[PDB]
């Protein structure tokens, strides 16, 4: 299963 | 044996035509098992392998929420990159990311990955230590400082060393009947005259899995890789792959050439020659 | 950076005239991802064509598999036509059952 990514560059 | 899980993502901006296109796929070894395409009214992540269809509704719900969140963050990231590079909103750009893990036969983590690319070129990547970064240019150096300050590496490392490996082991057991089975290639040699003095010998490997394989042509036992035409390993469309190697030989020398095949599904390397 | 696509057109199984099979067109090593691929039968576009979801290789270049069910014959000619920003004109690769 995937990882969580809410904000980010 | 050794296995891997990988999630690929691609966002492409579409100036004047709508929001960016976001497409992501997940793979276990060379087997595709999940997909999500933003180009829909109510997109959801969908199964692409039979052993993943058994996951309950909470699994698809969470995956879809994560996919939608990644599409949104990618849209924001594309805007940030336009500023870092002083680029115009009128031009299309691409943002790609891949992350995953490798496990050895013991089921323990071998290596983790997390890397980004902008317009098809390396942008920033997580180092093998799963704790430091490698930036490709000055713009990526801005991201690196931001990610270092936000402790991004330690969070990714926690996922890569935990859930990534644990869920890969889960899929490997559920798909044991296919993921832990190596399909040997079906092989044969074909002959195609080019003229009355030359002919093409083509060595085929079909319906094999995984994709890794080595095909070599030898003349009197000497490798002829310099004069060998080798096509890229290609998908058959049924989850297995195909590949072929060919050499042009002077008419009458055909029986001196042998094709050598190496694949994990074969107990020993295979030696083949044209059998008219 | 932009990279031109490699193109391979082949059948899923060894061609046998009169027997159903699958005609494939594998495009890879290209960038950007915008691409137009068509399967042709005697110079005419085939409409029942599906394709895999965009993915990419270690060097970030993309790859796609376009496919359709077909029944090869000795007379019918098949091909794959690809248009990409790196090509000044569509590129047509004819299907060769020996490749």
Numbering used by the authors:
A (entry chain C): 1 to 9
B (entry chain A): 1 to 276
C (entry chain B): 1 to 99
Publication text:
Major Histocompatibility Complex class I (MHC-I) molecules present peptide antigens on the surface of nucleated cells for immune surveillance, allowing CD8+ cytotoxic T-lymphocytes to eliminate infected or cancerous cells. The repertoire of peptides presented by major histocompatibility complex class I (MHC-I) molecules on the cell surface is tailored by the ER-resident peptide loading complex (PLC), which contains the exchange catalyst tapasin. Tapasin stabilizes MHC-I molecules and promotes the formation of stable peptide-MHC-I (pMHC-I) complexes that serve as T cell antigens. The F-pocket of MHC-I, which accommodates the C-terminus of the bound peptide, is critical for MHC-I stability and peptide binding and displays high allelic variation.
To better understand the peptide-editing process of MHC-I, we investigated the dynamic properties of MHC-I in complex with a photocleavable peptide (pMHC-I), and then followed the changes upon UV exposure by NMR spectrometry. First, we characterized the dynamics of the human allotype B*27:09 in complex with the photoRL9 peptide (peptide sequence is listed in Supplementary Table 1) by 1H-13C multiple-quantum Carr-Purcell-Meiboom-Gill (CPMG) relaxation dispersion NMR experiments. Indeed, we could observe a relatively large number of methyl-group containing residues exerting conformational exchange and these residues are mainly in the binding groove and polarized towards the α2-helix side of it. UV exposure of the photoRL9 peptide results in a 7-mer and a dipeptide fragment. Mass spectrometry analysis showed that the 7-mer fragment remains bound to the binding groove of B*27:09 after UV exposure. The melting temperature Tm of the cleaved B*27:09/photoRL9 was lower than that of the intact pMHC-I. Thus, our data indicates that the release of the C-terminal dipeptide fragment in the F-pocket upon UV exposure turns B*27:09/photoRL9 into a peptide-receptive state, featured by structural and dynamic changes in the binding groove, especially changes in the F-pocket region of the pMHC-I. In particular, signal intensity of F-pocket residue T143 is significantly attenuated, together with other F-pocket residues N97, A117, indicating that tapasin-induced altered F-pocket dynamics similar to the features seen for the pMHC-I molecule devoid of the C-terminal dipeptide after UV- exposure. Unexpectedly, residue T143 was also affected by adding ERp57-TsnL18G, which suggests that this mutation in the loop does not significantly affect tapasin interacting with pMHC-I’s F-pocket region, although L18 is critical for the catalytic activity of tapasin. It is well known that T143 as well as Y84 form essential H-bonds with the carboxyl group of the bound peptide in the pMHC-I and we also observed these two H-bonds in the crystal structure of B*27:09/photoRL9.
